[PDB]
Amino acid sequence: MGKRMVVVGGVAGGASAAAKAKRENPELEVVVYEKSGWVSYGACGLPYVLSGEIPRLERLVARTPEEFRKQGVLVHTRHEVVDVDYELRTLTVHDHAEGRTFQDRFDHLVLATGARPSLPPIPGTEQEGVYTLRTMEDGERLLKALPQARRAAILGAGYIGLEAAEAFRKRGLQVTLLEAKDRPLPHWDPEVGALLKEELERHGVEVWTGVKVEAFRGMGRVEAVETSEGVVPADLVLLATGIRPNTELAQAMGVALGPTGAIATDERMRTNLEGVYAAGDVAESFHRVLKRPYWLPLGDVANKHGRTAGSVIAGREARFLGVVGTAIFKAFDLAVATTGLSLEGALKEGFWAKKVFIQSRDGAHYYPGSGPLWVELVYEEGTGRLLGGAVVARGHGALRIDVLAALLHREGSVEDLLALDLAYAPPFSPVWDPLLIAAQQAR
Amino acid sequence: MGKRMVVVGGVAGGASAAAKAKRENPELEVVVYEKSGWVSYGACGLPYVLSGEIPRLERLVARTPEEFRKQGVLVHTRHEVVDVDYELRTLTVHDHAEGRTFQDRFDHLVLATGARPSLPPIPGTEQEGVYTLRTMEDGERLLKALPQARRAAILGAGYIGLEAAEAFRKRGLQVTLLEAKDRPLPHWDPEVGALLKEELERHGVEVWTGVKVEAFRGMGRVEAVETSEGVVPADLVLLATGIRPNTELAQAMGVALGPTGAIATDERMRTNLEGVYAAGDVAESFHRVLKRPYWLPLGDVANKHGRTAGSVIAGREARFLGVVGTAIFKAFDLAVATTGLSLEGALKEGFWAKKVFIQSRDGAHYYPGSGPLWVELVYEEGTGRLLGGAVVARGHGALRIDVLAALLHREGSVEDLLALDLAYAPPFSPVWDPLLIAAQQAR
Ligand SMILES: Cc1cc2nc3c(=O)[nH]c(=O)nc-3n(C[C@H](O)[C@H](O)[C@H](O)COP(=O)(O)OP(=O)(O)OC[C@H]3O[C@@H](n4cnc5c(N)ncnc54)[C@H](O)[C@@H]3O)c2cc1C
Ligand SMILES: Cc1cc2nc3c(=O)[nH]c(=O)nc-3n(C[C@H](O)[C@H](O)[C@H](O)COP(=O)(O)OP(=O)(O)OC[C@H]3O[C@@H](n4cnc5c(N)ncnc54)[C@H](O)[C@@H]3O)c2cc1C
Ligand SMILES: *SCCNC(=O)CCNC(=O)[C@H](O)C(C)(C)COP(=O)(O)OP(=O)(O)OC[C@H]1O[C@@H](n2cnc3c(N)ncnc32)[C@H](O)[C@@H]1OP(=O)(O)O
Ligand SMILES: *SCCNC(=O)CCNC(=O)[C@H](O)C(C)(C)COP(=O)(O)OP(=O)(O)OC[C@H]1O[C@@H](n2cnc3c(N)ncnc32)[C@H](O)[C@@H]1OP(=O)(O)O
């Protein structure tokens, strides 16, 4: 057929779906309504623009609405879809331009509305030098503030935020990191959190742990941040305290939410409504270690959602088979990569789990320049089944984390990892690869 | 028990076996007879010493015969075992020192005699500035020649050799590489060979292809190299034309050779004689793709052989389960990694094979400094079974090859590779990893 595919949200989930659908079946009428007035850009690259290493913000955009148009996709920015006459039963889309508002119909709907920052209930948040890092607009705002230092406070030591702290330092500001839990990257076992505190401090960043941020002092400007632990002075504060999915429009139309709070889907990215798909940070994925639905808002998983929904719609056979949790980020001179479960969470889940954490090198002892490389394995006591792992390196990189993700995918044991024929040469790994030395193999 | 383990050869296969045996069962009497007067060193590091990046040759040694002594291991250098009174029936070792010669018995024998360079039959090979690169002594010779340039010719565009060309250039010589087949790294599909010719040329190496080297000109010195294609003047020539295993002693004593020419072994590193083990470059390994024995003289496989023999001898349980062919090397600004079969070889085996070869980046398009990264996939037409793969990068780091080796190990298809949850972040890979984009996925 030659029906009409309407995508709500044009960032990554949505742009993927739109592009793949149109390519796979050009008969389709493909239209994207994006509320933010930018479409198809790399939010992940924001801290590299902030820091100054990337010259202009437009460098993050993958496809422009003009290029899309050339490829038969119609994108409208600053268009918000406000209601859907679902089932119910189509019309459905009423959305809003500049000036007007209006109706449109759909045969296939892709809900790709993403996620918004989850702010903690703190008096003072509303003031003037308080910021959030999620969109190109947040990028513009912060980029305007940044020159004209001087003192920054970042609430939250997760990904945005560890990443932000590096950006701010490279811009001259003095930066103090306030985390509510007891280490940076609280979400993982604490050997990694340690290495990270050390690097952050090595670079001039002050890291407060166990902090109860009480309020942001000022008369609508902000100059302070009063905490249980004292008072941090600050003329720019970044709230980097987590995200939650944008499921609001979807609930209105009667799309089901899964246990995590994100929209539920199948291997086909289909929601509980015929005709309605979901993709990207709004959508749950199946976790292959935990064997249940799980929320993993990364950009690679949003592209995979997109591409599947799009393929399915254009009537190609395509399925999305889950995730395992692989993540990697850069904080100064560390590249930190986790996958699967940490030992904390593997015990919360009930496994009789143990960990091993070793430090090795990233090249032969004798090779000039070789740095350190640490690798953690989280496994089941008796079976030896892998359940998670980390590696941290300076490397561009390592990234050997991908081997563990491959093993997590099938069931995969420490014994399987041991048997692997990995690559060795003096510039790139010691003759026993850190993955192999970690395996069983040392403590 | 507390019997006597004699290791013939002390370089890597042998030193591993010696150290792990002694660790695992200190009762053992463990003695290593090494004919070269150096023991336990990283031959792989020689080109880095040649080039000057590593200051002194002793930096490549891992354990000294004094440190071995401390650990209960007796190493004798410059001792060549000349005969074995096998089965037959022990005595057996007659070997030779400085001065004398003498007997020794064994209860466990590890054959770890390695490989020697395989010279082509060219008149003039015997002259003065013609070299080979395999041992520490070869290192010293070359290191003596090198300052005092001027013009080098390297026969052979495989691994030693591609690696040597970089070393010699870094030392100022002008270098021209003569290969007999039609591309550098002829033993792999020719896209890689191409990328390599371009880099070598970009750095001032001349690469002659399809050359019939006919003789080395000189009056016992060498100044030339006469070829079918012209005459290369050269005052230093490196013969980098391959190696063959050292099976000579082993055959005398009636150890079986496998079809490759290397000593045959089981998963416990045992030869056909009770008591007699083989480890390292003299020993065959089971190839898991081809499902037969295969000769893969790499140093990580030599440590695996040796660690296994040692464990087994000390009475631990240990098995060596095979290889798949993973190899990585550095040639100027390229890191080149292969694993499995190439399309050429996969067809020669009979599979109905296809390739795909894509060029992607090593980090997001917008990320400053991100370089190119090429990945190759060799697969079976119908089943989709992976059969081999390459990736080439500048990266110290990629090395993503390890992923494909994980897949090769079980059977592992393109579909399997497609389902993997790889790591993404802008400094490290684009949002689709180059392994994914190569899967099925583009051509
Ligand atoms: C600073 C930063 C760094 C990051 N780094 C990484 C990284 O290193 N690795 C990684 O894998 N991931 C990273 N991410 C994650 C990445 O941003 C998201 O996973 C990714 O962009 C996928 O999002 P998506 O397309 O589902 O929706 P989003 O990108 O959240 O986009 C949704 C868009 O849809 C629009 N929309 C919402 N509601 C409506 C409506 N009612 N009508 C019309 N339009 C609507 C919104 O305007 C929004 O712009 C990073 C994110 C940030 C913010
Ligand atoms: C220049 C160069 C670069 C390399 N780069 C890499 C790389 O990047 N990656 C990689 O994985 N591998 C690399 N290798 C391979 C590596 O050298 C071998 O795989 C490794 O050293 C394993 O060898 P082995 O212990 O079986 O024996 P060898 O290292 O060949 O040692 C055998 C020793 O046994 C002694 N011996 C022989 N016969 C007798 C006898 N009858 N009596 C007593 N002693 C005897 C010999 O003197 C010899 O010194 C490289 C090799 C070279 C030469
Ligand atoms: S923080 C989130 C990360 N950033 C984002 O995801 C936001 C920007 N990305 C997007 O919005 C989408 O990914 C866009 C660019 C809108 C969707 O793009 P397409 O779906 O059009 O993607 P491409 O054109 O990149 O890829 C399509 C086909 O092209 C093949 N291919 C990609 N790269 C290569 C290389 N280097 N060499 C050979 N082929 C390549 C892909 O395999 C893909 O294959 P099809 O089978 O044709 O779809
Ligand atoms: S070109 C060939 C490459 N170079 C060579 O192989 C030549 C030099 N190598 C050798 O000759 C042998 O490998 C030697 C060093 C003689 C044999 O060494 P060992 O067998 O004694 O090796 P190690 O002492 O390195 O390792 C033994 C145990 O120690 C554990 N381990 C190593 N590295 C680490 C780190 N970074 N962190 C924690 N543990 C570590 C190994 O797991 C190994 O464990 P066991 O279970 O005790 O054997």
Ligand SMILES: NC(=O)c1ccc[n+]([C@@H]2O[C@H](COP(=O)([O-])OP(=O)(O)OC[C@H]3O[C@@H](n4cnc5c(N)ncnc54)[C@H](O)[C@@H]3O)[C@@H](O)[C@H]2O)c1
């Ligand atoms: N490289 C990557 O893979 C990468 C990088 C950036 C962003 N992202 C995506 O976007 C998401 C952004 O994560 P994030 O850093 O915003 O959230 P997060 O959940 O990863 O944060 C960890 C949290 O400890 C909690 N905490 C500390 N002080 C607090 C306080 N004072 N009040 C309330 N909470 C406090 C913090 O809020 C901090 O966010 C990531 O989880 C990821 O999905 C990915």
Ligand SMILES: NC(=O)c1ccc[n+]([C@@H]2O[C@H](COP(=O)([O-])OP(=O)(O)OC[C@H]3O[C@@H](n4cnc5c(N)ncnc54)[C@H](O)[C@@H]3O)[C@@H](O)[C@H]2O)c1
């Ligand atoms: N990084 C690594 O994985 C690495 C690096 C170096 C050495 N090694 C180990 O040691 C081995 C050494 O390999 P190599 O480079 O000596 O052999 P090779 O077999 O890999 O070499 C390829 C051959 O084409 C043949 N050729 C070109 N001109 C010729 C001629 N004129 N006459 C005869 N042959 C000619 C060359 O001889 C060249 O050797 C490797 O295979 C590997 O086992 C490994």
